[PDB]
Design an enzyme around this catalytic site. Sequence first.
Site, PDB file in Angstrom:
ATOM      1  CG  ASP A  42      20.822 114.832  55.873  1.00 29.43           C
ATOM      2  OD1 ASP A  42      21.668 113.705  56.063  1.00 29.43           O
ATOM      3  OD2 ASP A  42      19.509 114.693  55.513  1.00 29.43           O
ATOM      4  CD  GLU A  85      24.185 111.099  54.254  1.00 26.40           C
ATOM      5  OE1 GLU A  85      24.075 110.183  54.446  1.00 26.40           O
ATOM      6  OE2 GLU A  85      23.202 111.929  54.243  1.00 26.40           O
TER       7      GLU A  85
HETATM    8  O1  LIG Z   1      25.495 103.608  51.632  1.00 28.22           O
HETATM    9  C1  LIG Z   1      24.721 103.027  50.425  1.00 28.22           C
HETATM   10  C2  LIG Z   1      23.422 103.111  50.823  1.00 28.22           C
HETATM   11  O2  LIG Z   1      23.169 104.610  51.016  1.00 28.22           O
HETATM   12  C3  LIG Z   1      22.119 104.712  51.771  1.00 28.22           C
HETATM   13  O3  LIG Z   1      22.102 106.048  52.864  1.00 28.22           O
HETATM   14  C4  LIG Z   1      21.092 104.905  50.615  1.00 28.22           C
HETATM   15  O4  LIG Z   1      19.921 105.238  51.190  1.00 28.22           O
HETATM   16  C5  LIG Z   1      20.943 103.314  50.390  1.00 28.22           C
HETATM   17  O5  LIG Z   1      19.847 102.931  49.379  1.00 28.22           O
HETATM   18  C6  LIG Z   1      22.356 102.810  49.999  1.00 28.22           C
HETATM   19  O6  LIG Z   1      22.285 101.352  50.029  1.00 28.22           O
END
Ligand SMILES: OC[C@H]1O[C@@H](O)[C@H](O)[C@@H](O)[C@@H]1O
Length: 580
Positions: free
Chosen positions: A262, A295
């Site tokens: 994660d 991730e």
């Molecule tokens: O997928 C792109 C996005 O990923 C998110 O999980 C980030 O926290 C976010 O700031 C971004 O806009």
Amino acid sequence: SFQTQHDPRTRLGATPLPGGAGTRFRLWTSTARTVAVRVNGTEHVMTSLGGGIYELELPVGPGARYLFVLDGVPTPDPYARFLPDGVHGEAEVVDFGTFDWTDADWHGIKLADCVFYEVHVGTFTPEGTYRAAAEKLPYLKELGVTAIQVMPLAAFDGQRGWGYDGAAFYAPYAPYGRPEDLMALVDAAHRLGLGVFLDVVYNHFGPSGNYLSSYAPSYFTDRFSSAWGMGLDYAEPHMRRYVTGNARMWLRDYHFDGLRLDATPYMTDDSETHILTELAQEIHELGGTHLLLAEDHRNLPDLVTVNHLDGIWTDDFHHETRVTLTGEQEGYYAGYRGGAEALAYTIRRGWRYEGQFWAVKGEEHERGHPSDALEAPNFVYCIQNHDQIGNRPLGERLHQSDGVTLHEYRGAAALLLTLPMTPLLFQGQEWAASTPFQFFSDHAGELGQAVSEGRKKEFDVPDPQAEQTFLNSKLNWAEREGGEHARTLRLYRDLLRLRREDPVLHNRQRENLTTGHDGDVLWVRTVTGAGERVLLWNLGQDTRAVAEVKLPFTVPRRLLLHTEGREDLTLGAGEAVLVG
Ligand SMILES: OC[C@H]1O[C@@H](O)[C@H](O)[C@@H](O)[C@@H]1O
Ligand SMILES: OC[C@H]1O[C@H](O[C@H]2O[C@H](CO)[C@@H](O)[C@H](O)[C@H]2O)[C@H](O)[C@@H](O)[C@@H]1O
Ligand SMILES: OC[C@H]1O[C@H](O[C@H]2O[C@H](CO)[C@@H](O)[C@H](O)[C@H]2O)[C@H](O)[C@@H](O)[C@@H]1O
Ligand SMILES: [Mg+2]
């Protein structure tokens, strides 16, 4: 010549001794003046070894209950292997040698062969346990998925939760089942030839039940924070080993085939060898075929080519697809136009942002890096996952968002499941499940009231703390037997069979994949020594004949699969066809 830093002799926590001699208890503390273990209600002073290391061996066996006593304060073991009374209770001594594994003929699964199916143990079945989940394994095998991706299992506080508030990383969450119930689930999956992957959270601990600072404040740093507390200090070797020892537990002792890390952008580490590289080293030392996925939103190929991870969950594909189908522009969706030409580009490049400016308000920067080094399996694609459903105010699924038809939903499945990228499905996706997947938690006292208040303010929004929110997210299996649910399920079964059987779709090389568009029609073409396939998806509002699509090659003639089961090569609004 990498040597693991782990030796069972010196393992922190409670470890059964050979020869039925009992259990060895070990801990590290930088600050306690008196140190004892309290086993089955009786205290015993532990031996100081130097370096803040304390140890004691006693003739108690697996099943004994214990915690540590630091300057007279009873304190749970952060290295607990099980916590039957939850995260503020005594740990149980666990012996990993007692389970009778039957999976000696299972040898893991390669990334290029994965089709992931994301399960949340608590909501996957009425009982919400491993034993109940294991009973659905034959269904998943027949469906045609090949790897279950389990949401986090580290023990957290309360009687339900997604798993991202895990606090005792080595202890599987007791409401799901005991350690042998988890082992039974993995063994059953392997007997059916399914891989099993675990979501692990090495960027933060949850707010309740993390006692590591009671032992040594220096596990954590004030240099940066997490969502819940002080950041995890990867300059501190004991912090590094807390998470590499945990990764090795899950893979070696529970027979998981891989881990999904994660939020890797938030695993901050300025060490010469980054903690992600050391994790890869430590898991590889086990001498198996285990995989590590990240991730990670940075669109950073170095996760694979430098840290030696196997692949990356890459959301640009998901986001471009959702904007194509809904037009929505809130939050990070503002980064995407959507549409056939946009989707053709994102697929071509693997991810969209390769260093261009990300113009999303509050987040502006030059986002990403060239994806050239990565091959198709290194990208994990989806159209649904826990976050892309649950982080919506009402937790609705893609077919349940305003303006999305089931025909468009069925087309999106065809695009996902014929691409050479590694796909992931979310539980119930395959039958267009009627139930949402909402954010739910069960924290105590003021913390619980704060969660409810935080959710209300951020966005009637379901109260995460309410039992009803958990129950509303439970899968309804019976519904898959009828109506449009059954129709969707037949299509998913057909797509997964084609992915498995079709010799051209076996392609896993971006060299053999091209994409383009004609107006609102997307096409994706695969050409190998086995032949040619083309997926066409009509993302327009009108009907389009395949014969009339302008293409820079001659379209293949044979209709292999139509998402609405039509006989002719014509695409209604939102429909797709695979030809060969
Ligand atoms: O997928 C792109 C996005 O990923 C998110 O999980 C980030 O926290 C976010 O700031 C971004 O806009
Ligand atoms: O800052 C992170 C890394 O950036 C570069 O690597 C990315 O971009 C390269 C071309 O610009 C690609 O070849 C590579 O695959 C990408 O990861 C830089 O080359 C790296 O050394 C940096 O660590
Ligand atoms: O209708 C006004 C909007 O038109 C465009 O958005 C539509 O078309 C996109 C493809 O070009 C789709 O992906 C999207 O879902 C549609 O809403 C335009 O991009 C928007 O800015 C306009 O508001
Ligand atoms: Mg045209």
